[PDB]
């Protein structure tokens, strides 16, 4: 049991707290790309995170999955999930949903891979401003989000999943995904609880 | 569910040569229930011990991954709020030993690791990169946590992942599952033992 | 005093082995421009990586250029850059930071966009090499005493052996040049002219 | 043309202050093994500064040059300076200098590559703790020191390179080494300087 074993202990939120959009770009919201199940109910919850996170002068990234455009970084994940190297850096479905477009200062990170932290300067860009609390939201939770949130959680940063701000193609994956990560490593709760608990 | 397939997740990921086996966290902590075993992990931990015998007599690079937490607590992180047995891990705690069965040998790497993945504050990339491994076979403890963060890692760095389904072990069998799932579906080969000792 | 290194062991060969890459430092219109970032050997250190450049296309070796890339907005603007703040204007679309003409990329050669020194530090260079299995990679750009040495370093901790085209590294200023070079070859590289380079 | 083209600009000073001494090691202290030049000297500098930052409770952090018993990991490193392969765990060459001995709460980083950074747990370590500012001191000048001043700026850290309480083996390396670090990657000053502003 977990129970037994001490995991899922509660894990303190502290400021300065930041924002990070994991991929939440037109080819994950259009369900015949690679989106689906509750990916758009989540996007549309997070622009009153985002909204929050602006107000408060919080820190804010996007990340991006592209790929070269003559498939030069096309890598092992693009063997598995093919479609990931259509994922271009002018291509529409790379391009960020304009619910969340970014503003000026909010550092957009474009990757290769799940991690927004993997091969990026995320981890840097984070460090730099002091931020000790990252509010997570974006797609999918059992891709890119959880394997952002167990680097964000490596990398010395506390995770706060907005659990109604990650969405998944599946819910079974979703739900199992977000148990791990309550589990192992985040705080995990709904949006109005985060940005209550955070001021 | 069916969106896995008509997105085009799951593709097959082919077995390429330089071949190499990590092994994650196969330590007695992690054998022991009392501490963090429990499940399918000792089942894992002696199926594993063929996949090892065969990286030697194969003249594979094996690499072992170890938990390891500073004797005074000066390297507690987040990892360890969030599960704060792990701080017992330390270096000279049986706990932390890798498990006799899977004792190293001479030319076999140790990470010492405070996260999940061996490959995060590690020289596993490195290491893995010099010796010119195409494809990384691995096992370890547990499915939904520190295997699944390697794999996700080892796939990003560039390796070719193939899990060995019957030498990866959770505490809990839905955990166990829903990985392996998603393991399958966008960062892995997957495949038992003998299918993968066969086709390497 | 000098000495010392060859006491100590410094400066052993690093024996070179293939497959063999090409990583393009940085030589970007701004540090070609003797007005802007450039000016020292880093004119005449373009030119004679042409001929690497186009080696290493007859010979199919990967090819990876660098080039420093900040957001239009400042919004990534970091320590590197209150350090020197005119990399802070290497935009995207500036054409300071476009890649000089002379070298300009191909099909299947890397472009990685950084803003650090290193081709390494934050990018997926690491991944990219690994994946191709090079063993040793050809380092050319500017500048010297920055971010070549920078990513030279890297490339060594990443796994690579480096060789440095000593005579396709340029720097603004010919002391820190010729200092950098010096501790490269004692610690981290193999150094030799692309002549030398090109024939092994 | 460093001057003409906007180098050397000033790198303010900015609290939470960190201190990270890069293998001041048994080793590095020995003119025998890896020793000599101006080595020893910032090692007794370091002493003043790291007494310091215990009085004022800062995050402090030691690396240390260990490579496997078996050469496991031996590595492109370890070809160019074999030596470094004889640093292990338990040899009392790779043993922080006495001086100089970590306190509990003090990370103690080990690696097999020259910046104290890459392949470790230091960037993630000094990020949980908010560290803005981070004081470097140790061996060599123009080896580790450098390579970890250039990854602290790197990772998001305002470096200060305390040019008194870094030393290497030869003047050359040392002093080009500091003019580098000082036009591109940090704020270099004395222990003096560095403790009376932080």
Redesign the interface.
């Known amino acids: 049991?977990?129970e037994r074993?001490?995991?899922?202990?509660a894990?303190?939120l502290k400021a300065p707290y930041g924002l990070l959009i994991v991929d939440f770009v037109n080819g994950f919201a259009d369900?015949a790309?690679?989106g689906?199940?509750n990916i758009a109910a989540a996007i549309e919850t997070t622009r009153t995170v985002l909204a929050a996170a602006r107000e408060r002068g919080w820190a804010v990234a996007h990340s991006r999955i592209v790929y070269?455009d003559?498939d030069?970084?096309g890598?092992?994940?693009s063997?598995?999930?093919?479609?990931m190297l259509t994922l271009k850096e002018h291509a529409p479905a790379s391009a960020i949903v304009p619910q969340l477009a970014p503003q000026?200062?909010?550092?957009?990170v474009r990757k290769?891979?799940?991690?927004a932290f993997?091969?990026?300067?995320l981890?840097?860009?984070?460090?730099?401003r002091?931020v000790?609390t990252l509010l997570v939201a974006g797609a999918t939770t059992?891709?890119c989000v959880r394997?952002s949130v167990?680097?964000a959680?490596?990398?010395?940063?506390?995770?706060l999943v907005l659990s109604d701000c990650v969405g998944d193609?599946?819910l079974?994956?979703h739900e199992?995904?977000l148990?791990?990560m309550r589990?192992?490593?985040?705080a995990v709760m709904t949006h109005d609880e985060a940005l209550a608990k955070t001021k």
């Open positions: 049991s977990y074993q001490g995991f899922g202990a894990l303190p369900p790309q690679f689906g199940g070269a003559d030069a970084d890598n092992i994940f063997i598995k999930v093919p479609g000026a200062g909010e550092y957009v290769s891979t799940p991690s993997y091969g990026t300067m981890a840097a860009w984070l460090a730099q002091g000790q059992s891709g394997a167990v680097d959680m490596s990398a010395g940063f506390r995770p193609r599946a079974g994956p199992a995904n148990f791990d589990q192992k490593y985040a």
